[PDB]
Amino acid sequence: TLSILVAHDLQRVIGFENQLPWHLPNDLKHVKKLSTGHTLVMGRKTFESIGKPLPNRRNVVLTSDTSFNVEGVDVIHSIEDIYQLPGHVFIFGGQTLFEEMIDKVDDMYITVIEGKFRGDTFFPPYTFEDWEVASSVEGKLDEKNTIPHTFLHLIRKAVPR
Ligand SMILES: NC(=O)c1ccc[n+]([C@@H]2O[C@H](COP(=O)([O-])OP(=O)(O)OC[C@H]3O[C@@H](n4cnc5c(N)ncnc54)[C@H](OP(=O)(O)O)[C@@H]3O)[C@@H](O)[C@H]2O)c1
Numbered sequence: 001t002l003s004i005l006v007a008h009d010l011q012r013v014i015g016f017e018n019q020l021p022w023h024l025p026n027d028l029k030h031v032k033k034l035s036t037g038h039t040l041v042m043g044r045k046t047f048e049s050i051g052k053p054l055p056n057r058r059n060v061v062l063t064s065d066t067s068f069n070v071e072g073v074d075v076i077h078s079i080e081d082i083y084q085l086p087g088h089v090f091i092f093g094g095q096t097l098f099e100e101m102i103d104k105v106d107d108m109y110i111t112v113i114e115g116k117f118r119g120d121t122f123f124p125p126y127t128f129e130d131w132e133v134a135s136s137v138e139g140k141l142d143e144k145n146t147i148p149h150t151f152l153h154l155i156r157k158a159v160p161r
């Protein structure tokens with residue numbers, strides 16, 4: 001399976017100055033739960049932002065840098081390399097990867113952050129006309145998680161007739 005994994009706000013902002021614009025621990029727990037034991041594919045900037053590989057799953061970084069070498073990270077140099085990756089693969093970001101992959105993935109795990117943040121990077125537009133809502137679950141609010149948010153699992157609709 002090839003899936004997108006992303007958090008975007010009401011205007012599809014996903015990032016600002018190479019960081020997530022929001023502080024929302026529950027979404028990172030969501031990410032952890034979904035991707036543990038599987039594979040993350042991310043652009044070089046997204047990797048450098050996180051700073052190191054995330055434990056207990058395969059970290060794959062897409063970059064044109066042939067000198068790129070990071071312990072615990074596997075490197076690829078073209079989109080076509082993604083399709084050779086075994087198992088469940090999650091497109092992890094950032095803007096560039098999402099734009100390149102949104103027309104190619106089976107499904108998307110989207111956390112909608114129900115707010116409006118200042119951003120400099122965005123998820124591509126999409127329409128629910130193309131995507132079935134396999135599930136929609138409101139995130140729980142509390143002390144450490146103060147921004148309303150919704151976990152969507154979207155599956156690409158088949159065009160029939
Ligand atoms: N909210 C979310 O869910 C979420 C998801 C992840 C990241 N973010 C964010 O997204 C932002 C950054 O996105 P971004 O687009 O600027 O950077 P990015 O997608 O993370 O990575 C950019 C880079 O990946 C490369 N790359 C992409 N396609 C390639 C290809 N076909 N062949 C070879 N290399 C390729 C390049 O590396 P080289 O330049 O080294 O060649 C490139 O400059 C940040 O602000 C960050 O916080 C948010």
Ligand SMILES: CCC[C@H]1c2ccccc2C=NN1C(=O)/C=C/c1cc(Cc2cnc(N)nc2N)cc(OC)c1OC
Nearest residue numbers: 005006007019020028029031032049050054055092093111
């Ligand atoms: C609960 C522990 C948190 C932790 C972790 C620890 C150990 C093992 C696995 C993981 C799983 N990922 N974890 C992270 O800190 C990742 C954070 C992160 C992520 C994303 C991507 C992302 C963000 N959000 C969404 N929905 N899609 C996404 N694709 C982007 C980031 O910066 C730009 C991140 O850094 C803040």
